[PDB]
Symmetry: C3
Subunit: 217 residues, 3 copies
């Protein structure tokens, strides 16, 4: 009459949890929570552009630690490593690294030119010192960005880039990050053969990834 078979009820809950679980994973994926904001890294780095890049970097790192404790690499794991990709060369200092985000210090003391690359991500560069030249695809003119300005590099977009002597910046990336190192290490494999740098980069990502997991606990 008002009863329910205990056998039918057992299967109903299994169809229920299947329905609930499939709904739960979409809501969580949709949430898309990010640790940093695109305009925040740009606004924060703009303040230190007036200083010499050495003092600016050290001051910026200190500020970024107190804002987001547990999301920045410790001093013992901070390290400059060269970056060779797209035919240009620079140097990075990884500050933050997840599977969806990264924040790093980038720049050159000699300057360099090359292919920007096409990433499955959106990358924002804010100039602390020097110059950033950009040549968008399909155009015959270039633009130049000075200290205080920010150049954003959309996903799937390819440009030509040029850095002037002693150019430095704070960079924020957002997207499928492990796919980004695929381009960042292309010239390192086939042009420079610098496997020690290759180790440094992967170690920095790993130590950056380790931090994010343990902070989660």
């Amino acid at each position: 009459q008002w009863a329910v078979g205990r056998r039918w009820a057992w299967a109903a809950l299994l169809l229920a949890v299947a329905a609930v679980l499939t709904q739960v994973v979409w809501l969580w994926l949709g949430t898309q929570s990010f640790v940093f904001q695109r305009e925040e890294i740009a606004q924060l780095a703009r303040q230190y552009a007036g200083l010499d890049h050495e003092l600016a970097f050290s001051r910026l790192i200190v500020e970024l630690r107190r804002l987001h404790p547990g999301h920045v690499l410790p001093d013992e794991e901070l390290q400059w490593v060269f970056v060779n990709a797209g035919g240009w060369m620079g140097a990075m200092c990884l500050l933050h690294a997840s599977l969806s985000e990264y924040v790093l210090l980038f720049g050159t003391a000699l300057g360099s030119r090359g292919h920007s690359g096409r990433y499955w991500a959106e990358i924002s560069d804010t100039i602390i010192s020097g110059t950033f030249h950009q040549w968008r695809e399909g155009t015959t003119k270039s633009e130049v960005f000075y200290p205080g300005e920010t150049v954003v590099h959309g996903p799937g977009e390819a440009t030509a880039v040029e850095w002037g002597p002693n150019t430095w910046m704070v960079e924020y990336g957002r997207g499928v990050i492990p796919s980004t190192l695929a381009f960042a290490l292309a010239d390192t494999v086939f042009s420079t053969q610098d496997f020690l740098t290759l180790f440094y980069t992967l170690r920095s990502y790993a130590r950056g990834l380790r931090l994010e997991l343990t902070t989660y606990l």
Copy 2:
């Protein structure tokens, strides 16, 4: 059973003789001086207007051998360490006419081709360092620089350098070099596709005009 291979080779032998004859009776749409003198006259203009003026004039002199506006496209070129942009106007198996240059400037290996490459400069500078030499030469707007087949030099484009380029030789082979960095350095396969497509479009045009 040995008669099967004979017929397969006989029909292969005759087709090879057809190709050989056809390759021998070939005539060229464009002349070497034709492109050089036509370019030099627009070199005094800004490169944007120089290009558009030249394209139209090239269409007027050789109708059916220049790509339509809907198939014109700037595509990045990455080879020999340097980087520039290209816009293909004409392309067969033996000839090509394109616009080339860079808004930033670039340096690298000239590349060794199975072709003769001629570049008349509209703007900027072209620096050349010939193999075996310890001095460089510079070419300015209005001048034409010639890169012979087999030759390898070191090249340097100053900022905002542009040129009209006419190539004559085994054109499908030159593609091999121009996409070398694209595979091993830039990994820009979208650009690779753009390049191969613009070539196909050029081949399609020449084929249709030939057949009507």
Copy 3:
């Protein structure tokens, strides 16, 4: 007496033939010998300096410098930079070559299992050490040493020419110098030239070692 189912027997022999090998190693040039000599010719026109240096080098070490018929400028592409080299001496452990550019270049120094010192005859040499955010500049007369394992970013100005002496596991350094030649320029001809240059250095050294 029987032993059941050698490394100890093998390890002893191999280490004590390697240590015996390291002790019988003899270098043709001193660590600073090339640098002192090259320093004397800096400031001259690089072609004059090179010729004078080659004569003096042949005089100081007969049997270890390549003949005029085996001297050649070959393009070098590696780490994103491009230059030209003239090999003068080459073994498995040492090499002496003339290096430079007419246009200038920028790239990766490379990580060698060898120590490399460069004495500038003309131009400028910019060096950016790893882990630093500043660069240093060397002018004609100065010597830049590249220690084993070290990696820097280097830059040559237009008409920068130098004398280079390297010491260490030389064949491994050749792997780096041919990197861009193989994967970027596809210039097999230069790849042939360089390997031939190395072979000729090795041939001379083998002959000189055997028959004095």
